[PDB]
Design a protein around this ligand. Sequence first.
Ligand SMILES: *[C@@H]1O[C@H](CO[C@@H]2O[C@@H](C)[C@@H](O)[C@@H](O)[C@@H]2O)[C@@H](O[C@@H]2O[C@H](CO)[C@@H](O[C@@H]3O[C@H](CO[C@H]4O[C@H](CO)[C@@H](O)[C@H](O)[C@@H]4O)[C@@H](O)[C@H](O[C@H]4O[C@H](CO)[C@@H](O)[C@H](O)[C@@H]4O)[C@@H]3O)[C@H](O)[C@H]2NC(C)=O)[C@H](O)[C@H]1NC(C)=O
Ligand SMILES: *[C@@H]1O[C@H](CO[C@@H]2O[C@@H](C)[C@@H](O)[C@@H](O)[C@@H]2O)[C@@H](O[C@@H]2O[C@H](CO)[C@@H](O[C@@H]3O[C@H](CO)[C@@H](O)[C@H](O[C@H]4O[C@H](CO)[C@@H](O)[C@H](O)[C@@H]4O)[C@@H]3O)[C@H](O)[C@H]2NC(C)=O)[C@H](O)[C@H]1NC(C)=O
Ligand SMILES: *[C@@H]1O[C@H](CO)[C@@H](O[C@@H]2O[C@H](CO)[C@@H](O[C@@H]3O[C@H](CO)[C@@H](O)[C@H](O)[C@@H]3O)[C@H](O)[C@H]2NC(C)=O)[C@H](O)[C@H]1NC(C)=O
Ligand SMILES: *[C@@H]1O[C@H](CO)[C@@H](O[C@@H]2O[C@H](CO)[C@@H](O)[C@H](O)[C@H]2NC(C)=O)[C@H](O)[C@H]1NC(C)=O
Lengths: 72, 22, 48
Amino acid sequence: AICHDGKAHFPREGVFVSNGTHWFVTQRNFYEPQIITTDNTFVSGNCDVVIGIVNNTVYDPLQPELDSFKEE
Amino acid sequence: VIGIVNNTVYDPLQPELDSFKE
Amino acid sequence: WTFGAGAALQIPFAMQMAYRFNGIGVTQNVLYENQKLIANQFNSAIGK
Ligand SMILES: *[C@@H]1O[C@H](CO[C@@H]2O[C@@H](C)[C@@H](O)[C@@H](O)[C@@H]2O)[C@@H](O[C@@H]2O[C@H](CO)[C@@H](O[C@@H]3O[C@H](CO[C@H]4O[C@H](CO)[C@@H](O)[C@H](O)[C@@H]4O)[C@@H](O)[C@H](O[C@H]4O[C@H](CO)[C@@H](O)[C@H](O)[C@@H]4O)[C@@H]3O)[C@H](O)[C@H]2NC(C)=O)[C@H](O)[C@H]1NC(C)=O
Ligand SMILES: *[C@@H]1O[C@H](CO[C@@H]2O[C@@H](C)[C@@H](O)[C@@H](O)[C@@H]2O)[C@@H](O[C@@H]2O[C@H](CO)[C@@H](O[C@@H]3O[C@H](CO)[C@@H](O)[C@H](O[C@H]4O[C@H](CO)[C@@H](O)[C@H](O)[C@@H]4O)[C@@H]3O)[C@H](O)[C@H]2NC(C)=O)[C@H](O)[C@H]1NC(C)=O
Ligand SMILES: *[C@@H]1O[C@H](CO)[C@@H](O[C@@H]2O[C@H](CO)[C@@H](O[C@@H]3O[C@H](CO)[C@@H](O)[C@H](O)[C@@H]3O)[C@H](O)[C@H]2NC(C)=O)[C@H](O)[C@H]1NC(C)=O
Ligand SMILES: *[C@@H]1O[C@H](CO)[C@@H](O[C@@H]2O[C@H](CO)[C@@H](O)[C@H](O)[C@H]2NC(C)=O)[C@H](O)[C@H]1NC(C)=O
């Protein structure tokens, strides 16, 4: 899983992988990395239960749209 | 891709905020 | 199950069980939250 803001994130379909420096979510049967966003993952519980969870920021696709909405 | 075709893809979020603009 | 379809691809057993749970139609968060209970139940069943 992934720890983002005290909330555990799990891949909707796929698996979390890391090349050594950054994290991605990719389909299990073919390596094509994708940025970990709220669309790739679903939230469940908090960070204190899962064994082996790792912190990493989870990108929010709606955040840039909100920023532009605020700007103009 | 082979056979891809040109078509507009409606974005539901855009009108929701665009109407708020006015 | 990867070794039965081709080259054996390693994967942590917890993640494999999560895949299996997804297979039977149960969200993987269930396993990732109850891992201790599932492991204890499996060990007890093997002992039985
Ligand atoms: C979807 O439409 C495509 C035609 O229109 C393009 O796609 C739509 C959706 C819009 O985004 C539009 O802005 C696009 O242009 C169609 O394939 C397309 O094939 C045409 C060529 O017939 C490509 O147009 C490119 O135009 C630029 C600039 O235009 C001037 O120069 C060209 C030079 O050929 C002249 O022919 C024009 O009359 C203008 O004077 C060119 O620089 C470019 O030349 C080369 O690069 C393209 C790159 O694709 C090649 O296809 C060309 O053959 C040349 O080698 C083009 O002429 C257009 O880029 C291209 N778009 C795509 C996505 O391939 C496509 O079949 C439609 N359906 C799909 C993609 O499923
Ligand atoms: C593990 O993966 C991360 C994330 O990036 C991923 O790998 C890249 C190689 C590429 O395929 C990405 O599409 C993919 O998501 C790597 O760290 C990030 O990516 C690169 C380094 O790989 C760095 O940031 C920038 O990433 C841009 C997109 O790849 C890249 O274009 C940038 O290159 C710079 O220079 C070129 C040439 O002059 C220029 O065109 C660019 O515009 C840019 O200035 C730059 O590398 C950071 O490391 C991370 N950036 C992010 C997430 O935005 C990571 O490198 C990789 N692990 C290892 C060991 O490499
Ligand atoms: C991922 O991030 C969380 C939160 O940052 C990590 O929890 C860690 O635990 C505490 C609680 O916030 C953070 O401070 C700690 O406080 C205790 C008690 O005062 C103190 O004894 C510790 O020395 C520490 O100061 C801690 O910063 C926080 N971050 C860590 C440990 O990196 C969680 O552990 C992180 N998990 C991973 C895999 O990175
Ligand atoms: C699908 O088939 C059409 C033709 O039926 C292809 O378009 C071309 O159309 C001309 C008609 O004069 C034919 O002579 C060509 O043979 C056709 N090209 C090919 C490769 O068949 C078209 O390429 C195909 N396009 C798809 C599936 O998107």
